[PDB]
Symmetry: C4
Subunit: 93 residues, 4 copies
């Protein structure tokens, strides 16, 4: 779906921005920055908190701005792709 693609591109770009930020300012390895971006914007959460005042402020802003994006993408991911595939199997061809 076109909208689903827009939401994917936006989500990936958001997670790239978060990865870059947290690997630079917080000194995280990229994978750790990606994990933190993912677990922050999806609201799962992790065992670590940001240590720089700049990191804390950015995380606040990143949450409010990316949370809705990531959950719109999760909704479309579940609805235009995961649940329907299984529901195609409910009819025995």
């Amino acid at each position: 779906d076109k909208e689903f693609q827009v939401l994917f591109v936006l989500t990936i770009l958001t997670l790239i921005s978060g990865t870059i930020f947290y690997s630079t300012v917080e000194g995280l390895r990229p994978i750790d920055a990606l994990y933190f971006s993912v677990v922050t914007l999806t609201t799962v959460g992790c065992d670590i908190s940001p240590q720089t005042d700049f990191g804390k402020i950015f995380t606040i802003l990143y949450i409010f701005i990316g949370i809705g994006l990531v959950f719109g993408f999760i909704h479309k991911l579940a609805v235009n792709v995961q649940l329907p595939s299984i529901l195609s199997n409910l009819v025995p061809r």
Copy 2:
């Protein structure tokens, strides 16, 4: 009916099994702790443990994106086909 709900239940169970196996082997958690990690992640509660392997972080990211929509679709249908019915149905003479 409770036919879609059954589908979401089986999908959620298999998802939690996959997470259980994954986190028990790669992260060395006991199976109950792997099931707990799978459950608290996909429900977004989270916990004070975080994966230690780069493989575990990559998998957890993908597991989050794919399984939040299933686990919460299951919770939604559990509320709409089992919880909401039993309450209202009892709010009658």
Copy 3:
């Protein structure tokens, strides 16, 4: 609203059950058990995880069963009470 009251009574009973369980099996002070019940069922999360296998299993079950209840109550709390009061102030009597 009648339904709002049903949801409150259910929510309070749920948090009582969780408080009792976690203070007995996990040895938490009641307030700590109440905090854990609250932060678990609302998905905020805390810095501690359950330590007993029994505690872990119960938390899994408690999440799936109480999560929908607590968020239905949060919705009605925001919608039949908090947001509307403020919206009554939007019209200058």
Copy 4:
């Protein structure tokens, strides 16, 4: 329009201010850390810190119940009146 959205924005800001003041005085957090705690709690991300005073736990429980609906209503309207419009409006010739 963006009139209800403005109301949710001001309510969210005042809620975050209240949390900031509360957690800075009773829990001895720096103000930025109190703002962070308020923000990650009400967005349900959570963090590795937990309140130490019994007063802080009681307040946090009430703050969660009252402010999740506001903070997420604000995120919903931010997505529906600011984020969804700017994307689609740009998905035109």
